Design a protein around this ligand. Structure first.
Ligand SMILES: [Mg+2]
Lengths: 105, 681
DNA sequence: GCCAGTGCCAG
DNA sequence: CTGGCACTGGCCG
């Protein structure tokens, strides 16, 4: 259920999509990114109704991250109607993520 | 004999005031201090020593004290003062000859800590005096609540400056006697502090006289400077900068930017176990932050959102965005391997080698990235030219003086072998005419860029070089074994084709490549093999050239015994000791030193002959030495007629040098007349 | 600011 | 082989 973005599909899959979209900017060499990975898989299932979860590997797709001023990973950007609604950086826990989504959905 | 030193308000180029001077006279065994109003008396005392046919000792006096006194005497007293070369001794020149195996700070111009090996103590102190004085001055000011300014310690005379002046002479005298105690250069039977100048030069080893003559002449050369075309280089800089930018544009398009961990202060530990993971990038664990703000209402007392982006406890990896830098070997390596490149050779530190040779052999699938490698090689070369000519700390454009000339420094005996070293900037490393942009670089250095002080007409350049000096030096040394056979071949027939046959080589060019490398103690890249055929090439060469094998053996038996040495030095042509760093480089040391001393005596004799013919050395005269690059000299001449005379005189001087040291191989020179270094190659 | 590491330019 | 010096990248106050 997780959408794997690319620099070329980002605009249409995220910016011009409907509903809430949670984007995770990550890299294979980051410890925290690997921590939150499993959590994101479970979040995609739960909010399978009112939320779409997408991932963008910054090494394979170097063009997008710079546009949002990434300063650390994992960076979670919540998009709504083509714009960043909320943003949180770090390996949030299952519960913490839940609260973040609930409070912003 | 007297020992002296002066303190003035600036470096030679801009000195305007004599602050003080100190003189130690060996005849009275007393020190005498001269304050600012005693300048005239200071000069009279030096001239009195000259009138006695005496000697004046300075530390670095050839380049500073002597020339500064001439300048200051004219500016302050409207007096003509010119100490003769024969009456002056320089302990820095002596130290560089006797302790040639050691480095020195070049009077504080170089950082002590960056130099390899040990440093002679007295010389170290003399070279650090300015820095110490500045430190004493500074703390004395700050203790008085006064702010220090750039270099105010030299604006006015003061008593602590006088004290440093006295100390300099005390140490210079100590250095002098330490140097004079070396019996290899100074016969013990003679007290060199109690003899006239003629005895001093004639009774000391020949090398002592040659080194002082070389330093006197080269100080003059530095003063002359090399006329430089500033405008042409500024235009070259614009051209190079434009190509650099375009290459960067292309390369940054081909190789995109990426993220790298940076700023991590915490070790990443396994959430499950807890075992540290040093390999993973360092992380950061925010201590503050949450989803909601800490509340302010009954509804919430049982909530406002925290717009901040961090959550206490939730670790992340700090990263920085990096753009491709074509000058970074690390980026180059990173991008090329990602393209499929597989390194074959690394450095002793593990990093893969990224030099022109390996880059040329790199093969990747993507044609754009493959072609980008040429852009990288070109970018690296362009950067090298830009750094040397305009942006580097020692760039030509930063060194050109008001007189439109570059006054590079020369250490007359900076190399262990007796060769000179050049710096600030190094005028012995200007790109050759055959390398990219070499013609423009070379053309910017030339006599044509100096307009005569009277007529306004550009001067002309005479470029003279010693012909195949290294090989002729080899022929000389093998003569006791082949009776001049190699020498006869050099000037009658072809020595390179002769070596080609000797070392079973395919192309004559391979011979020239083989010889000039065999002397450097070197491999098979000449033919295309390596570390296998090479061994066979040496044995075959030495087998068909028995005289060179004999020479090598004789050298060895003289230095080594098993490394356990019997003597770690070779006697140079003028009798000096030449330190041998390694047994394998012994022959190269012998040959390079021979060429160096030959060229040193050659430029000295050439100028003396020009002077005896009536020509005046200087821009206010007939000719001016502008550069000495090991086996060649570039001389500015007021007219073409003079240039022809300089060229012809240089040939006569070389023949005189060969005869002087009974060389077993005839020595020659070749000269060219033109407007600049590009033409006079 | 410095110290290493690497590489290239001259002869 | 003998030298000078430019750049990058890590550490530092
Ligand atoms: Mg002095």
């Amino acid at each position: 259920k997780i959408i794997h973005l690319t620099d070329d599909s980002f605009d249409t899959d995220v910016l011009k999509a409907d509903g809430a979209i949670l984007v995770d900017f990550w890299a294979e060499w980051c410890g925290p990114c690997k921590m939150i990975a499993p959590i994101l898989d479970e979040i995609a299932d739960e909010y399978q109704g009112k939320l779409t979860v997408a991932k963008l590997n910054i090494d394979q797709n170097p063009g997008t991250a710079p546009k949002y001023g990434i300063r650390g990973i994992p960076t979670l950007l919540l998009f709504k109607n083509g714009e960043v609604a909320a943003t949180k950086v770090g390996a949030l826990s299952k519960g913490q993520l839940k609260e973040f989504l609930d409070a912003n959905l | 004999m007297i020992v002296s030193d002066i303190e003035a308000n600036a470096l030679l180029e801009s000195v305007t005031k004599f602050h003080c001077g100190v003189i130690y006279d060996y005849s009275t065994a007393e020190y005498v201090s001269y304050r600012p109003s005693d300048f005239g008396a200071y000069l009279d005392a030096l001239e009195a020593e000259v009138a006695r046919g005496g000697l004046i000792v300075f530390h670095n006096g050839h380049k500073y004290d002597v020339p500064a006194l001439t300048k200051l005497a004219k500016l302050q007293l409207n007096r003509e003062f010119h100490l003769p070369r024969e009456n002056c001794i320089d302990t820095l020149v002596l130290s560089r000859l006797i302790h040639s195996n050691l480095k020195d700070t070049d009077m504080g111009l170089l950082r002590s800590g960056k130099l390899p090996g040990a440093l002679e103590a007295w010389g170290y102190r003399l070279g650090e005096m300015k820095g110490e004085y500045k430190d004493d001055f500074k703390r004395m000011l700050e203790e008085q609540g006064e702010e220090y300014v750039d270099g105010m310690e030299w604006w006015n005379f003061n008593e602590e400056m006088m004290d440093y002046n006295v100390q300099d002479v005390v140490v210079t005298k100590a250095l002098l006697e330490k140097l004079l105690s070396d019996k290899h250069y100074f016969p013990p039977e003679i007290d060199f502090t109690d003899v006239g100048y003629t005895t001093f030069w004639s009774e000391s080893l020949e090398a002592v006289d040659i080194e002082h003559r070389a330093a006197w002449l080269l100080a003059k050369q530095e003063r002359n400077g090399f006329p430089f075309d500033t405008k042409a280089i500024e235009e070259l800089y614009v051209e190079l900068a434009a190509r650099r930018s375009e290459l960067l544009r292309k390369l940054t398009e081909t190789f995109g930017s990426w993220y790298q961990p940076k700023g991590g202060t915490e070790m990443f530990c396994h959430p499950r176990t807890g075992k540290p993971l040093p390999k993973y990038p360092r992380i950061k664990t925010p201590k503050v932050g949450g989803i909601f703000k800490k509340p302010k209402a009954q509804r919430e007392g049982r909530c406002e959102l925290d717009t901040r982006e961090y959550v206490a406890g939730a670790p992340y990896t700090p990263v920085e965005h990096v753009v491709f830098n074509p000058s970074s070997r690390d980026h180059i390596q990173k991008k090329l391997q990602e393209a499929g490149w597989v390194p074959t050779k690394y450095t002793d530190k593990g990093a893969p080698v990224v030099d022109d040779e390996v880059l040329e052999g790199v093969r990747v699938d993507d044609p754009e990235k493959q072609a980008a490698i040429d852009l990288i090689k070109e970018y690296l070369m362009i950067q090298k030219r830009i750094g040397q000519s305009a942006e580097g700390d020692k760039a030509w454009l930063r060194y050109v003086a008001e007189d439109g000339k570059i006054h590079g420094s020369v250490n007359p005996n900076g190399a262990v072998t007796g060769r000179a070293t050049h710096a600030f900037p190094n005028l012995a490393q200007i790109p050759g005419v055959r390398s990219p942009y070499g013609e423009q670089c070379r053309a910017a250095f030339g006599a044509e860029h100096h307009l005569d002080g009277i007529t306004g007409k550009p001067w002309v350049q005479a470029g003279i070089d010693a012909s195949g000096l290294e090989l002729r030096c080899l022929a000389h040394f093998m003569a006791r074994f082949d009776n001049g056979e190699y020498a006869h071949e050099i000037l009658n027939g072809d020595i390179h084709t002769k070596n080609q046959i000797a070392a079973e080589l395919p192309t004559r060019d391979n011979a020239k490549t083989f010889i000039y490398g065999f002397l450097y103690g070197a491999i098979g890249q000449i033919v295309g093999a390596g570390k296998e055929r090479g061994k066979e090439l040496k044995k075959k060469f030495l087998e068909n050239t028995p005289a060179i094998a004999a020479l090598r053996e004789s050298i060895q038996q003289t230095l080594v015994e098993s490394v356990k040495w019997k003597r770690r030095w070779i006697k140079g042509l003028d009798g000096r000791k030449v330190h041998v760093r390694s047994p394998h480089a012994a022959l190269n040391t012998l040959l390079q030193s021979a060429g160096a001393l030959i060229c040193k005596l050659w430029i000295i004799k050439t100028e003396e002959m020009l002077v005896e013919k009536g020509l005046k050395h200087g821009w206010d005269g007939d000719f001016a030495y502008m550069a000495w690059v090991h086996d060649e000299i570039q001389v500015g001449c007021r007219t073409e007629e003079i240039a022809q005379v300089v060229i012809e005189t240089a040939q006569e001087a070389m023949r005189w040098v060969g005869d002087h040291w009974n060389f077993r191989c005839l020595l020659d020179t070749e000269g060219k007349m033109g407007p600049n270094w590009a033409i006079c190659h």
